Symmetry: D2
Subunit: 251 residues, 4 copies
């Protein structure tokens, strides 16, 4: 039987590339999404057309709330209902926008940014672990290579990403006796935000030592694939920067 | 005119030691507390006896919720109401208990552990900045062992990691306002009251420098430094005060 | 044409496992060694039996000295002499022994521990770049450099310096398309001299399986970093430590 | 009796400000220097005028060589000769220049950059510990807040500074049982090279979040004074950045 993976926020961009690569590798996939229902369904169609009964969708808001634990449980459940197992969890979904220290209420900003980047990852990890040889079980968290040199006015985003480093390490330690590995992949600049003008995008590309360009989504997915694979069986609690040297560049 | 500081969770232990040291240095202090009302008022009385009208208490739950931003704004407002200014914020209040991955609902655990250790510090920092040779700074009580965490303390460690990111992000953002943001990271200092002496000694014996925990005063000493004029170019730094504990491998 | 790799300290243990996987992957290999001449030749013989004219040995002391730059130049030169190209450098050779602060002179300890773990990697990196596909360097680092073994200050200093080199060289060589990365074991193959009770003490501390990494598990990470699946990765150090570095005292 | 400190590279700039502040705090000082004999002798004269026979000079090249251990031992010996004790060691002396990967020979560049920034600190640390409740013994290493975002083409310098972090941590662990604390101070940009034009100085100044200015030498010395003080007696293995936030600033 083919192993199964949950990928959060998998309808577009890097999450989509991760789902596709895992599927190409032989995984059945749960495509979690929030608002991008058309893209999610279209991706499930494409993957199932390649191999029948290998992709489903699951919608959920991952904003922090009283009902988030239930939603996270239901996401993991959807993998078991469809495929009978859940071998890999990829925590990719993420809110990302500025939250100046000096639009939404601040409590909503907290809920969205800390929920998606940290609390949902923790609750999903709990549900994954509770629900569990030649098993190769693991979790991959999408972190941020620049968390120690953060973007101006993104404090809640950076707090969420830092908490996700903490979860990666804490869960690596705690889940190791069950054979569940927990690792991260830290992009620098990859797919720039769609809102961004090609001029502003070019300002970022020029800062990258390796090629003066952003990472493709596929290059990010390559690191996830490595971490879930049998070639990474002794690796837990590690975060692999995939940043073309960007984090090494001083101001 | 004496400057003024808010210390969160200041009724006892490390927060009291910080409040006391700041008061001894010349500061007027807001002693914030949650449940420890008797201890808070008792400390405030001791301090006012030493110097009249230099200490007030301020009660608030710092659990995460939709009114937490209001509560934090009110804590800052309380400093201005009592003292007409707010020079220093010390983010010390913290919930600390295990949350195993495999009593309280997980919703509550998230709200308390992430609220006290990260979200309240963030909201307090916002309110502090919004209300502003001054020497304005914020000091966050971090944790020296965040990269070598206690087993089954995921949410607490997430909250402390978030606090490091706040320290950094806020140091970057508030520098143009003259507001320095730094941290102090104990390893083992005052052990939990619920801990047995045998288990306390097991932790003590792990510390290279003296085989003992830091006194609360030792932690406060590092806070005093960071708020002082001796630290005027220091921002975004977290000073471990851990007697070498974090350097010791398994 | 097959690409070519230099692996330092490749006669035995982890460096051997790295040479072997690189060769299995398609590389021609320079098996650098210092004292383990028969092991080096035996490995070359095995690899050439598999594919003729694809392995050579190269002898060099990597202790710091005024001739170290010439020796490191000669190692890289030996790869071009055998294979006409040098695509991958793996800085694996390492001295490892205590140097307490309170047989060998301290001058010698410094030369050996800092030469092998830091200065030789620097000079090999210089010569690698000067002599220039998917070009990259991998440095064997140490997952425990922030929680070091007692009385191992010079070894730890060298391993810290090697993190600095990994970072500085990734930055400086990126415009040449040369990626520079690290792999950081926690406990992998335990020292030959170490007694079994002391080995078991270390094994019990590893969260993931309560065992040391095989040399092959360390090599797997090296293979990933030199591969086309790591083309945007530079300046990264991948811990391969079973969670050991996360364990508090 | 007053305590005594050795400060390496103390004739000018940051080392000088550190020596002066220690002396002001009540310490007797060994002013180590290499080439700056006029400056070192003048400083000791100024300090001795303030309090008799409270300063001595000691010249040594801290380049790595066969004689470096003896030299470092003699620096420490000079403090015991002068003052009968040695309570504080400040490893401040440092060579700093580019060594591009692609005219001093490279072996000389190694010897100077690695010798001054790491090997000499290690040998001084050995000699200091070998010579050793009322006592307050400590070492402070001058590190670099930018070691993870290094200057282009400064690999050997950056290697030396990283090795110094390693030493700081290793020596902290190992010397803790003797009551010797080992810490660092990590400037970002402080006194800029003396030749540097103001317009280049301004390029770095404009990057510093806290006041768009470099640190004074005195601001650096303030962190050293804290670390050797009785207010830091539980602090060991810590490196305090004194950088105005510069290291937090992305490319
Ligand atoms: N792109 C980069 O350069 C970069 C850099 C550093 C780190 N990273 C990290 O890498 C990962 C992928 O980045 P990316 O640019 O592909 O991400 P992204 O497009 O910004 O967001 C990925 C998905 O997150 C989901 N999402 C957002 N808010 C949500 C909520 N409240 N509930 C549930 N899902 C929500 C969205 O789903 P729907 O579209 O279905 O609504 C969105 O498609 C992220 O974790 C990110 O932080 C990316
Ligand atoms: N002790 C250590 O060894 C150690 C080690 C590492 C880090 N630290 C850090 O240093 C700081 C001080 O440590 P400590 O041991 O003195 O702390 P503590 O006694 O565990 O907590 C201090 C105060 O936090 C307040 N608090 C807890 N939950 C709260 C809530 N929901 N709302 C508002 N306030 C709440 C409590 O106030 P009331 O009593 O008034 O309810 C409590 O007195 C903490 O940030 C801690 O994480 C300590
Ligand atoms: N094993 C572990 O648990 C572990 C843990 C952390 C990091 N690492 C790192 O991983 C790498 C491989 O580890 P390992 O245990 O396989 O290494 P090792 O067996 O201790 O050393 C590998 C080789 O280094 C060479 N070497 C030593 N001194 C030399 C000198 N002066 N000049 C030239 N070559 C010299 C030796 O070659 P000859 O035999 O030919 O003389 C030796 O076979 C090392 O960089 C090590 O620091 C290993
Ligand atoms: N300035 C900054 O912004 C900055 C930034 C990051 C870190 N730091 C660190 O802070 C410390 C002080 O910086 P600084 O700018 O004041 O340093 P500096 O002026 O560049 O150098 C300090 C002294 O080092 C001594 N020195 C140089 N080469 C030597 C050798 N071969 N042997 C013995 N002594 C030697 C020199 O002594 P003589 O003059 O007597 O020859 C020099 O005066 C250094 O460790 C530095 O790396 C400084
Ligand atoms: N660009 C970019 C993003 C980044 C980049 C982070 C960064 C932080 C500091 C400096 C440079 C880049 N993080 C993202 N997260 C989500 N969910 N979506 C995104 O588009 C990005
Ligand atoms: N002991 C202890 C504490 C710690 C210790 C953290 C630790 C983590 C890993 C290894 C050792 C100590 N953090 C605390 N936070 C609060 N609010 N109160 C506490 O009593 C502690
Ligand atoms: N075990 C082990 C080794 C280690 C392990 C380092 C370590 C440091 C701190 C805590 C645990 C392991 N490094 C080695 N380097 C070389 N060249 N050879 C070795 O055998 C080892
Ligand atoms: N400026 C500067 C210096 C620096 C600055 C290092 C740096 C590295 C990366 C980014 C910014 C500054 N280090 C120095 N060391 C010595 N001995 N002397 C110096 O003048 C400096």
């Amino acid at each position: 039987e083919a192993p199964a993976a949950v990928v959060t926020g998998a309808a577009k961009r890097i999450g989509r590339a991760i789902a596709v690569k895992l599927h190409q590798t032989g995984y059945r996939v749960v495509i979690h999404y929030h608002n991008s229902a058309e893209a999610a369904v279209s991706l499930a169609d494409e993957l199932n057309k390649e191999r029948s009964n290998t992709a489903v969708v699951c919608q959920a808001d991952l904003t922090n709330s009283n009902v988030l634990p239930a939603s996270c449980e239901e996401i993991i459940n959807s993998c078991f209902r469809a495929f009978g197992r859940c071998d890999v969890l990829v925590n990719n979904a993420s809110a990302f926008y500025p939250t100046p220290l000096v639009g939404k209420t601040v409590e909503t900003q907290v809920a969205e940014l800390i929920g998606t980047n940290a609390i949902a990852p923790f609750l999903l990890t709990m549900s994954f672990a509770q629900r569990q040889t030649s098993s190769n079980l693991s979790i991959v968290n999408l972190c941020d290579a620049m968390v120690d040199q953060p973007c101006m006015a993104f404090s809640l985003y950076n707090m969420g990403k830092h908490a996700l480093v903490g979860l990666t390490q804490s869960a690596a330690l705690e889940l190791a006796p069950y054979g569940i590995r927990v690792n991260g992949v830290a992009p620098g600049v990859s797919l720039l935000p769609v809102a961004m003008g090609e001029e502003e995008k070019d300002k970022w590309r020029r800062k990258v030592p390796l090629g003066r360009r952003e990472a493709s989504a596929e290059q990010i997915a390559d690191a996830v694939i490595f971490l879930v694979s049998g070639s990474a069986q002794y690796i837990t609690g590690s975060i692999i920067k995939v940043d073309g040297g960007l984090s090494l560049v001083h101001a």
